[PDB]
Amino acid sequence: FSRIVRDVERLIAVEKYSLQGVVDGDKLLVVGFSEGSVNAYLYDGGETVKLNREPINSVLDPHYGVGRVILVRDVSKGAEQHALFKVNTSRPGEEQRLEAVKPMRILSGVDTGEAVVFTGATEDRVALYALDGGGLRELARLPGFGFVSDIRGDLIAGLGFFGGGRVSLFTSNLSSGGLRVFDSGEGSFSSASISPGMKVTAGLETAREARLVTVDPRDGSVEDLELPSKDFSSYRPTAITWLGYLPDGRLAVVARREGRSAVFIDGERVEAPQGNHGRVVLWRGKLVTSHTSLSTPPRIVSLPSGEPLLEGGLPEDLRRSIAGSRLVWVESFDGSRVPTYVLESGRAPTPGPTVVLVHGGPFAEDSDSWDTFAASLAAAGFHVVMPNYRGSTGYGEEWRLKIIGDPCGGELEDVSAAARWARESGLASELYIMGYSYGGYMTLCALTMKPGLFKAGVAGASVVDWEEMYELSDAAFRNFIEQLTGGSREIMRSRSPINHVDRIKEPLALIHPQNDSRTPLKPLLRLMGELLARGKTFEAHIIPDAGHAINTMEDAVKILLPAVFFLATQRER
Amino acid sequence: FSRIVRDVERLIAVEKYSLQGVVDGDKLLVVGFSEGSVNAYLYDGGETVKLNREPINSVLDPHYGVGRVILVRDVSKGAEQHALFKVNTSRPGEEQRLEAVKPMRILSGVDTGEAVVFTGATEDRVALYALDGGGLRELARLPGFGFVSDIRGDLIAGLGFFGGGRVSLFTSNLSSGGLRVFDSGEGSFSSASISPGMKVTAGLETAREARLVTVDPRDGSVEDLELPSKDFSSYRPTAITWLGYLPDGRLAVVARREGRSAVFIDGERVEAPQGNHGRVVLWRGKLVTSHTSLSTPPRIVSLPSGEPLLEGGLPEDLRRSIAGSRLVWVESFDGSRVPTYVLESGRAPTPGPTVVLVHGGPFAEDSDSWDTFAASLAAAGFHVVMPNYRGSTGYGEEWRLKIIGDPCGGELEDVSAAARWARESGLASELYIMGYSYGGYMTLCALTMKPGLFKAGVAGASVVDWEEMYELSDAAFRNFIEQLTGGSREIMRSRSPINHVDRIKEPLALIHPQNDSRTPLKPLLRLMGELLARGKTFEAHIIPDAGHAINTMEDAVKILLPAVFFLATQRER
């Protein structure tokens, strides 16, 4: 149990890096979890320089070479009312709060150098904003969650979840605002970057595949974009992770199939370490991306050698605790094949104690990408099954959109199918479920709707009640709940696990940050009252002065430690 | 920290023993917290023999030599609805449930070998029961908490908390039942044992001094008992822990002053290890008692040598973590002197992080006795301050009875004076409050009524709302609440920290077993609601399938570990 603490601490503590851009002339801007919190750094080639003072949540996308960084930081103890802080790169550790922007949920943003352009959610709206030397301007109100993708000249390009789980492309004008929304009937836009010719290149993810298209923002004309090299189209990607024009005009694309990605410059394969990659930057005539895998914490590497620029290293005992990984295709209730990553623990027998670790989102995926939760479970003697239930990204629009209107429906059947597969295939001697956010909702749904499937469940930062949550949500989250539930009152009630507590037969652990503004604490307290009144076994841990986005080691530990303890305790019986 | 977990674990894991009597001819009957849980053992000079199968809570007091033991086990996952199980001492590990006794809160009991006589509380009454060969009989209904002390022949003697915090003597007849209650106007009876002459020898605790009396149960006449040796009366005890007749007719008395006890046989002092002692038994012609101190976990020893028969060795590193202890007399608001035990941690500076650790009860005391919580605090690098606030035992009837009608009044002032004493004496560089049960009530009362006094508070198994708790309480606890509060609804409301949440300014850690039936979880969930709605910082840890009485190592870890983590975190800032 003290060994579990050491394992969880060191898994959280290992340095994790994400590539944000190039700044300060010719230096990497990198967001790193290092020295126990999320900070932003310049990487010159040798020593990193820390840009921020206190922990941050993120940084805005910098235009190449801009001489500043815009930090995004929660100023509300985890409720995700962020403020923006400017740091001049020549003077690291000196912060200027951008006081023209009232705290709000910052969803995204780019800094051109002249203007800081972002989307943000308040109680009454999601909006696209620009802050220049003249002051703050609302460029447009957006229908739902929206994200700035790119800016070139006065053209802004972004992606919008504006209905039915579909992603629209949007543009606006930096100088005079407005909104133009481009919707594909074939699928969803997944990344965007403005070409030198002032067209929007976008990934378009259709039924079971992904391709690149050009959108002219003047008329709504969409063509297929063909590249000089044909490696990209032959790769037959299912998803586009990211794309962007480099300063030399070449289009870089990270695309993926089956939970691993590949890098392309102007269509041509650039070799990269196995796993997943993030944005690709040009830096000192070398391609640089982020790399991660189930065995590799996020790190910065140079392509095509794959040599690390910035990486944290795991202790050898923790590396060994992960025996192997594999993708399997689990047949579900309608014969659909649920792509399921399996992390085999080198610290459990086969069959052995097995956790179905259910991903959040739901528009997210279990890929060959580092997962601290999964790693801590493998360290603690559990195999880990991570099913890409319908709703997941990475496997086509059709699979992703199947969740719409059907929470605690087919996706739960997929999660249950992976569970039964883990037993039937001989992997699991016993079964647990665990999840954070939409994953925690799945824990609650599994224990309420599928009693006896799992031995016990962990529900972290859970959706508990669509109805009460709606009442407490900001404009983005209200809209997203509308989308997920299809605007159906019956769905919001019947698919809320708080309404099926009497069905629970298994021990449940609840973990919840008190200031969560995504999945609020209030319905969780009501759930505890229901568990109590109905004589159900439950454990609960409420984390102080924290919300949904964990950005310190001590909060990461508070969230994960009790989950690992609980399951380890359950394994004694 | 993993080092904290390890120390906490090792402190919990150390075996702790209580002496219950002599059975199976001439074998000691002990209850040991051992091998991870509370169990019953025979000891006859070598290895213990485990009598129970699953963990228990206690055993009933056996008459010398009886060939069986009656286990008391919680059969409601911590809610303290107990069933009785008999184990024939010749056939250890084979239990037979006494099915005539439906689950109830068993408060006490004696087993003559032919009749099991006990007190228990259901929802509607507290009663004295006898189970013999002809079945179960209710001998009498008691006004409130009552405990059987002794049976000789047909006579039963007990102690009753039957009004005003005062303890009465009561008798009954095993054959015919009934109830006779004897009050003293000078004080409270603390201990009782029937003499050969069929009168009741009792400890009478008065204003300051305690003495031995003889109560004739036929007419209620009381006279002082003078013993052959005068070491006892000249010791001038303030409290009488225990007394009992030995097989040879000698009267064993354990009495105490200033948190330390002494043992007497027919009034003659018997040398014993410094600290506190429990019952004294004759085993193979010689004297045996339990012993505990601040630096020695409860153990069974021979007198007068002090040689251990059953002892969980305190490892040297943990022992060394307590650099010292002191008894101080804190000046309270009204000139009262609050006897306060202090532990200096060998792992903190002076001045240094200090926890006022508040005792439960309130009719209990901090004495020179083992305290796992205090030890873990010392191990974690905190000085510990343990004030015997008014309401405490050990310092006379007047001091103990001051709390009556005044919860969250003078006693909280004593606690606050102890905080002030810690700072002003130079011990404390910073101050926290921590407590379980009435102690947790004090945490909550301190953060609501004395904001800014402590840096942070830990409230375990707390009283939260007198009124709601009363309505959820069984007959015993309803009566006790009436006595403690005076029955006034204004006291019940005004002295409930849930009605003062607005004033809270310090971080608060709530810890609570889910099935607690003394201090129920329900009002604590409401408190969390209020903390949430009023934007207060808090954490909470609810522990599964557990109640107020902790009987496993892992449950004690779930109760204690969050507290130490919380305080350690608080000390970083």
PDB file of C-alpha atoms in Angstrom, chain B residues 305-522:
ATOM      1  CA  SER B 305       7.209  -7.493  37.977  1.00  0.00           C
ATOM      2  CA  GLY B 306       5.673  -5.869  34.882  1.00  0.00           C
ATOM      3  CA  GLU B 307       6.876  -8.754  32.702  1.00  0.00           C
ATOM      4  CA  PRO B 308       4.839  -8.959  29.466  1.00  0.00           C
ATOM      5  CA  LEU B 309       2.649 -11.988  28.695  1.00  0.00           C
ATOM      6  CA  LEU B 310       1.181 -10.501  25.516  1.00  0.00           C
ATOM      7  CA  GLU B 311       2.829  -7.463  23.994  1.00  0.00           C
ATOM      8  CA  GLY B 312       2.890  -5.913  20.542  1.00  0.00           C
ATOM      9  CA  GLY B 313       6.398  -4.472  20.447  1.00  0.00           C
ATOM     10  CA  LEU B 314       6.525  -0.758  19.520  1.00  0.00           C
ATOM     11  CA  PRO B 315       9.418  -0.597  17.017  1.00  0.00           C
ATOM     12  CA  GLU B 316      12.314   1.625  18.200  1.00  0.00           C
ATOM     13  CA  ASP B 317      12.083   4.123  15.289  1.00  0.00           C
ATOM     14  CA  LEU B 318       8.389   4.798  16.000  1.00  0.00           C
ATOM     15  CA  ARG B 319       9.006   5.015  19.778  1.00  0.00           C
ATOM     16  CA  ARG B 320      11.811   7.523  19.125  1.00  0.00           C
ATOM     17  CA  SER B 321       9.428   9.670  17.034  1.00  0.00           C
ATOM     18  CA  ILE B 322       7.957  10.819  20.378  1.00  0.00           C
ATOM     19  CA  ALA B 323      10.791  12.949  21.787  1.00  0.00           C
ATOM     20  CA  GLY B 324       8.883  13.613  25.009  1.00  0.00           C
ATOM     21  CA  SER B 325       5.628  13.978  26.876  1.00  0.00           C
ATOM     22  CA  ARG B 326       4.314  16.345  29.515  1.00  0.00           C
ATOM     23  CA  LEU B 327       1.253  16.969  31.595  1.00  0.00           C
ATOM     24  CA  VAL B 328       0.436  20.671  31.599  1.00  0.00           C
ATOM     25  CA  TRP B 329      -2.307  22.723  33.187  1.00  0.00           C
ATOM     26  CA  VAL B 330      -3.748  25.068  30.610  1.00  0.00           C
ATOM     27  CA  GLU B 331      -5.445  28.193  31.973  1.00  0.00           C
ATOM     28  CA  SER B 332      -8.916  28.400  30.485  1.00  0.00           C
ATOM     29  CA  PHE B 333     -11.262  31.411  30.003  1.00  0.00           C
ATOM     30  CA  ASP B 334     -12.738  31.120  33.526  1.00  0.00           C
ATOM     31  CA  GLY B 335      -9.591  30.291  35.534  1.00  0.00           C
ATOM     32  CA  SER B 336     -10.132  26.528  35.267  1.00  0.00           C
ATOM     33  CA  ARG B 337      -6.998  24.506  34.790  1.00  0.00           C
ATOM     34  CA  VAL B 338      -7.293  22.059  31.929  1.00  0.00           C
ATOM     35  CA  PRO B 339      -5.026  19.024  32.432  1.00  0.00           C
ATOM     36  CA  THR B 340      -3.493  18.592  29.026  1.00  0.00           C
ATOM     37  CA  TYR B 341      -1.189  15.866  27.766  1.00  0.00           C
ATOM     38  CA  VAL B 342       1.466  16.990  25.312  1.00  0.00           C
ATOM     39  CA  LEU B 343       3.581  14.950  22.936  1.00  0.00           C
ATOM     40  CA  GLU B 344       6.650  16.538  21.382  1.00  0.00           C
ATOM     41  CA  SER B 345       7.531  14.998  18.055  1.00  0.00           C
ATOM     42  CA  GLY B 346      11.159  14.035  17.530  1.00  0.00           C
ATOM     43  CA  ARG B 347      10.458  14.844  13.864  1.00  0.00           C
ATOM     44  CA  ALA B 348       9.419  18.486  14.201  1.00  0.00           C
ATOM     45  CA  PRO B 349      11.242  21.646  15.264  1.00  0.00           C
ATOM     46  CA  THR B 350      10.261  23.622  18.367  1.00  0.00           C
ATOM     47  CA  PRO B 351       8.363  25.762  17.832  1.00  0.00           C
ATOM     48  CA  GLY B 352       6.734  23.475  15.271  1.00  0.00           C
ATOM     49  CA  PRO B 353       3.566  22.215  13.598  1.00  0.00           C
ATOM     50  CA  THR B 354       1.172  21.288  16.404  1.00  0.00           C
ATOM     51  CA  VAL B 355      -2.143  19.473  16.455  1.00  0.00           C
ATOM     52  CA  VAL B 356      -4.654  19.924  19.254  1.00  0.00           C
ATOM     53  CA  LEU B 357      -6.026  16.354  19.107  1.00  0.00           C
ATOM     54  CA  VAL B 358      -9.449  16.434  20.810  1.00  0.00           C
ATOM     55  CA  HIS B 359     -10.724  13.369  22.637  1.00  0.00           C
ATOM     56  CA  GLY B 360     -14.132  11.834  22.097  1.00  0.00           C
ATOM     57  CA  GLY B 361     -16.754  10.994  24.674  1.00  0.00           C
ATOM     58  CA  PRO B 362     -17.113  13.543  26.032  1.00  0.00           C
ATOM     59  CA  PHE B 363     -16.867  11.312  29.142  1.00  0.00           C
ATOM     60  CA  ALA B 364     -13.359  10.157  28.383  1.00  0.00           C
ATOM     61  CA  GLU B 365      -9.890  11.487  28.952  1.00  0.00           C
ATOM     62  CA  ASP B 366      -6.458  11.961  27.539  1.00  0.00           C
ATOM     63  CA  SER B 367      -4.317  10.063  29.995  1.00  0.00           C
ATOM     64  CA  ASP B 368      -0.923   8.340  30.065  1.00  0.00           C
ATOM     65  CA  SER B 369      -2.374   5.757  27.679  1.00  0.00           C
ATOM     66  CA  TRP B 370      -1.660   4.638  24.138  1.00  0.00           C
ATOM     67  CA  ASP B 371      -3.209   6.798  21.462  1.00  0.00           C
ATOM     68  CA  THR B 372      -2.619   5.594  17.913  1.00  0.00           C
ATOM     69  CA  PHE B 373      -3.707   8.945  16.411  1.00  0.00           C
ATOM     70  CA  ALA B 374      -1.342  10.928  18.624  1.00  0.00           C
ATOM     71  CA  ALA B 375       1.537   8.565  17.857  1.00  0.00           C
ATOM     72  CA  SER B 376       0.905   8.809  14.101  1.00  0.00           C
ATOM     73  CA  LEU B 377       0.859  12.631  14.378  1.00  0.00           C
ATOM     74  CA  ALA B 378       4.192  12.549  16.231  1.00  0.00           C
ATOM     75  CA  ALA B 379       5.508  10.164  13.562  1.00  0.00           C
ATOM     76  CA  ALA B 380       4.344  12.567  10.828  1.00  0.00           C
ATOM     77  CA  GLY B 381       6.178  15.505  12.411  1.00  0.00           C
ATOM     78  CA  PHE B 382       3.505  17.181  14.573  1.00  0.00           C
ATOM     79  CA  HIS B 383       3.515  17.988  18.249  1.00  0.00           C
ATOM     80  CA  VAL B 384       0.274  16.841  19.828  1.00  0.00           C
ATOM     81  CA  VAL B 385      -1.843  18.646  22.414  1.00  0.00           C
ATOM     82  CA  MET B 386      -4.535  16.682  24.170  1.00  0.00           C
ATOM     83  CA  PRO B 387      -6.660  18.772  26.540  1.00  0.00           C
ATOM     84  CA  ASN B 388      -9.002  17.287  29.113  1.00  0.00           C
ATOM     85  CA  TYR B 389     -11.737  19.794  28.488  1.00  0.00           C
ATOM     86  CA  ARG B 390     -14.598  20.012  30.959  1.00  0.00           C
ATOM     87  CA  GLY B 391     -16.695  16.930  30.359  1.00  0.00           C
ATOM     88  CA  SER B 392     -13.548  14.802  30.679  1.00  0.00           C
ATOM     89  CA  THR B 393     -13.278  11.933  33.140  1.00  0.00           C
ATOM     90  CA  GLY B 394     -10.330  11.519  35.494  1.00  0.00           C
ATOM     91  CA  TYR B 395     -10.531  14.881  37.278  1.00  0.00           C
ATOM     92  CA  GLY B 396     -13.617  14.545  39.405  1.00  0.00           C
ATOM     93  CA  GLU B 397     -17.384  14.778  39.138  1.00  0.00           C
ATOM     94  CA  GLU B 398     -17.597  18.604  39.048  1.00  0.00           C
ATOM     95  CA  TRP B 399     -15.263  18.924  36.043  1.00  0.00           C
ATOM     96  CA  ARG B 400     -16.970  16.105  34.089  1.00  0.00           C
ATOM     97  CA  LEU B 401     -20.495  17.442  34.753  1.00  0.00           C
ATOM     98  CA  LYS B 402     -19.716  21.044  33.650  1.00  0.00           C
ATOM     99  CA  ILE B 403     -20.278  20.021  30.035  1.00  0.00           C
ATOM    100  CA  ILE B 404     -23.928  19.102  30.760  1.00  0.00           C
ATOM    101  CA  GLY B 405     -26.284  21.474  28.954  1.00  0.00           C
ATOM    102  CA  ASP B 406     -23.327  23.284  27.422  1.00  0.00           C
ATOM    103  CA  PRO B 407     -21.916  21.488  24.347  1.00  0.00           C
ATOM    104  CA  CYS B 408     -19.892  23.952  22.223  1.00  0.00           C
ATOM    105  CA  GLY B 409     -19.421  26.247  25.198  1.00  0.00           C
ATOM    106  CA  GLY B 410     -16.974  26.027  28.061  1.00  0.00           C
ATOM    107  CA  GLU B 411     -15.368  22.839  26.712  1.00  0.00           C
ATOM    108  CA  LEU B 412     -14.565  24.471  23.358  1.00  0.00           C
ATOM    109  CA  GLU B 413     -13.130  27.364  25.318  1.00  0.00           C
ATOM    110  CA  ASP B 414     -10.841  24.788  27.030  1.00  0.00           C
ATOM    111  CA  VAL B 415      -9.800  23.457  23.641  1.00  0.00           C
ATOM    112  CA  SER B 416      -9.106  27.015  22.473  1.00  0.00           C
ATOM    113  CA  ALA B 417      -7.135  27.756  25.640  1.00  0.00           C
ATOM    114  CA  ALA B 418      -5.030  24.714  24.851  1.00  0.00           C
ATOM    115  CA  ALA B 419      -4.392  26.107  21.363  1.00  0.00           C
ATOM    116  CA  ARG B 420      -3.377  29.443  22.901  1.00  0.00           C
ATOM    117  CA  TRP B 421      -1.261  27.614  25.463  1.00  0.00           C
ATOM    118  CA  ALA B 422       0.550  25.794  22.640  1.00  0.00           C
ATOM    119  CA  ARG B 423       1.469  29.006  20.858  1.00  0.00           C
ATOM    120  CA  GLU B 424       2.302  31.082  23.927  1.00  0.00           C
ATOM    121  CA  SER B 425       4.381  28.364  25.591  1.00  0.00           C
ATOM    122  CA  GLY B 426       6.580  28.275  22.485  1.00  0.00           C
ATOM    123  CA  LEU B 427       5.585  24.769  21.378  1.00  0.00           C
ATOM    124  CA  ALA B 428       3.541  25.598  18.279  1.00  0.00           C
ATOM    125  CA  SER B 429       4.672  27.472  15.169  1.00  0.00           C
ATOM    126  CA  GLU B 430       1.287  26.683  13.690  1.00  0.00           C
ATOM    127  CA  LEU B 431      -1.872  24.995  14.934  1.00  0.00           C
ATOM    128  CA  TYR B 432      -4.350  22.442  13.651  1.00  0.00           C
ATOM    129  CA  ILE B 433      -7.332  20.813  15.259  1.00  0.00           C
ATOM    130  CA  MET B 434      -8.196  17.137  14.814  1.00  0.00           C
ATOM    131  CA  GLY B 435     -10.660  14.835  16.522  1.00  0.00           C
ATOM    132  CA  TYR B 436     -12.916  11.797  16.145  1.00  0.00           C
ATOM    133  CA  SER B 437     -16.519  11.619  17.414  1.00  0.00           C
ATOM    134  CA  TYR B 438     -17.001  14.314  20.094  1.00  0.00           C
ATOM    135  CA  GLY B 439     -13.521  15.345  19.014  1.00  0.00           C
ATOM    136  CA  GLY B 440     -14.722  15.848  15.472  1.00  0.00           C
ATOM    137  CA  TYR B 441     -17.627  17.862  16.797  1.00  0.00           C
ATOM    138  CA  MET B 442     -14.996  20.054  18.457  1.00  0.00           C
ATOM    139  CA  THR B 443     -13.129  20.477  15.169  1.00  0.00           C
ATOM    140  CA  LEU B 444     -16.330  21.665  13.517  1.00  0.00           C
ATOM    141  CA  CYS B 445     -17.178  23.903  16.460  1.00  0.00           C
ATOM    142  CA  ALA B 446     -13.726  25.439  16.427  1.00  0.00           C
ATOM    143  CA  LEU B 447     -13.798  26.227  12.703  1.00  0.00           C
ATOM    144  CA  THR B 448     -17.317  27.717  12.919  1.00  0.00           C
ATOM    145  CA  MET B 449     -17.077  29.521  16.293  1.00  0.00           C
ATOM    146  CA  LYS B 450     -13.338  30.232  16.384  1.00  0.00           C
ATOM    147  CA  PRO B 451     -12.371  31.021  12.777  1.00  0.00           C
ATOM    148  CA  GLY B 452      -8.678  31.919  12.462  1.00  0.00           C
ATOM    149  CA  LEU B 453      -7.702  30.063  15.651  1.00  0.00           C
ATOM    150  CA  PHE B 454      -6.468  27.002  13.720  1.00  0.00           C
ATOM    151  CA  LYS B 455      -4.858  26.783  10.277  1.00  0.00           C
ATOM    152  CA  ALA B 456      -6.964  23.787   9.344  1.00  0.00           C
ATOM    153  CA  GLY B 457      -9.269  21.167  10.841  1.00  0.00           C
ATOM    154  CA  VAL B 458      -9.770  17.390  10.662  1.00  0.00           C
ATOM    155  CA  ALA B 459     -13.226  16.226  11.746  1.00  0.00           C
ATOM    156  CA  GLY B 460     -13.685  12.462  11.939  1.00  0.00           C
ATOM    157  CA  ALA B 461     -16.986  10.715  12.713  1.00  0.00           C
ATOM    158  CA  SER B 462     -18.256  14.110  13.825  1.00  0.00           C
ATOM    159  CA  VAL B 463     -21.386  15.246  15.545  1.00  0.00           C
ATOM    160  CA  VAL B 464     -22.811  17.693  13.022  1.00  0.00           C
ATOM    161  CA  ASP B 465     -26.419  18.313  14.009  1.00  0.00           C
ATOM    162  CA  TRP B 466     -27.797  17.340  17.424  1.00  0.00           C
ATOM    163  CA  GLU B 467     -31.413  17.413  16.258  1.00  0.00           C
ATOM    164  CA  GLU B 468     -31.121  15.403  13.062  1.00  0.00           C
ATOM    165  CA  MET B 469     -28.811  12.947  14.779  1.00  0.00           C
ATOM    166  CA  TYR B 470     -31.296  12.595  17.668  1.00  0.00           C
ATOM    167  CA  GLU B 471     -34.089  11.678  15.268  1.00  0.00           C
ATOM    168  CA  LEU B 472     -31.765   9.071  13.730  1.00  0.00           C
ATOM    169  CA  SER B 473     -30.560   7.692  17.072  1.00  0.00           C
ATOM    170  CA  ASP B 474     -31.547   4.564  19.013  1.00  0.00           C
ATOM    171  CA  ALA B 475     -32.859   4.742  22.628  1.00  0.00           C
ATOM    172  CA  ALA B 476     -29.438   4.887  24.231  1.00  0.00           C
ATOM    173  CA  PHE B 477     -28.138   7.693  22.054  1.00  0.00           C
ATOM    174  CA  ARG B 478     -31.394   9.678  22.150  1.00  0.00           C
ATOM    175  CA  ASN B 479     -31.201   9.598  25.930  1.00  0.00           C
ATOM    176  CA  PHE B 480     -27.504  10.519  25.938  1.00  0.00           C
ATOM    177  CA  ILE B 481     -28.112  13.473  23.577  1.00  0.00           C
ATOM    178  CA  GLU B 482     -30.928  14.694  25.865  1.00  0.00           C
ATOM    179  CA  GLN B 483     -28.584  14.523  28.847  1.00  0.00           C
ATOM    180  CA  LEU B 484     -25.656  16.217  27.100  1.00  0.00           C
ATOM    181  CA  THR B 485     -27.766  19.001  25.577  1.00  0.00           C
ATOM    182  CA  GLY B 486     -30.313  19.373  28.414  1.00  0.00           C
ATOM    183  CA  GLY B 487     -33.131  18.440  25.997  1.00  0.00           C
ATOM    184  CA  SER B 488     -33.495  22.072  24.926  1.00  0.00           C
ATOM    185  CA  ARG B 489     -34.152  22.412  21.176  1.00  0.00           C
ATOM    186  CA  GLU B 490     -32.361  25.819  21.262  1.00  0.00           C
ATOM    187  CA  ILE B 491     -29.189  24.164  22.600  1.00  0.00           C
ATOM    188  CA  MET B 492     -29.570  21.358  20.066  1.00  0.00           C
ATOM    189  CA  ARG B 493     -29.803  23.885  17.197  1.00  0.00           C
ATOM    190  CA  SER B 494     -27.515  26.712  18.306  1.00  0.00           C
ATOM    191  CA  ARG B 495     -24.668  24.328  19.279  1.00  0.00           C
ATOM    192  CA  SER B 496     -24.752  22.402  15.993  1.00  0.00           C
ATOM    193  CA  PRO B 497     -21.926  23.510  13.678  1.00  0.00           C
ATOM    194  CA  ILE B 498     -24.112  22.896  10.586  1.00  0.00           C
ATOM    195  CA  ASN B 499     -25.977  26.094  11.560  1.00  0.00           C
ATOM    196  CA  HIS B 500     -22.780  28.163  11.562  1.00  0.00           C
ATOM    197  CA  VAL B 501     -21.151  27.129   8.258  1.00  0.00           C
ATOM    198  CA  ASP B 502     -20.885  30.763   7.018  1.00  0.00           C
ATOM    199  CA  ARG B 503     -18.174  31.551   9.569  1.00  0.00           C
ATOM    200  CA  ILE B 504     -15.820  28.825   8.309  1.00  0.00           C
ATOM    201  CA  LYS B 505     -12.587  30.210   6.872  1.00  0.00           C
ATOM    202  CA  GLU B 506     -10.123  27.336   7.269  1.00  0.00           C
ATOM    203  CA  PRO B 507      -9.642  24.213   5.167  1.00  0.00           C
ATOM    204  CA  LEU B 508     -11.641  21.328   6.589  1.00  0.00           C
ATOM    205  CA  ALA B 509     -11.161  17.586   6.144  1.00  0.00           C
ATOM    206  CA  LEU B 510     -14.179  15.431   6.873  1.00  0.00           C
ATOM    207  CA  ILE B 511     -13.669  11.739   7.538  1.00  0.00           C
ATOM    208  CA  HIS B 512     -16.614   9.486   8.239  1.00  0.00           C
ATOM    209  CA  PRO B 513     -17.482   5.792   8.224  1.00  0.00           C
ATOM    210  CA  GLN B 514     -20.609   5.363   6.078  1.00  0.00           C
ATOM    211  CA  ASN B 515     -22.572   3.140   8.456  1.00  0.00           C
ATOM    212  CA  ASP B 516     -21.820   5.064  11.620  1.00  0.00           C
ATOM    213  CA  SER B 517     -24.865   4.750  13.888  1.00  0.00           C
ATOM    214  CA  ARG B 518     -23.638   6.937  16.764  1.00  0.00           C
ATOM    215  CA  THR B 519     -22.646   9.880  14.579  1.00  0.00           C
ATOM    216  CA  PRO B 520     -24.591   9.163  11.401  1.00  0.00           C
ATOM    217  CA  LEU B 521     -23.394  10.118   7.959  1.00  0.00           C
ATOM    218  CA  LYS B 522     -26.668  11.735   6.870  1.00  0.00           C
TER     219      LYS B 522
END
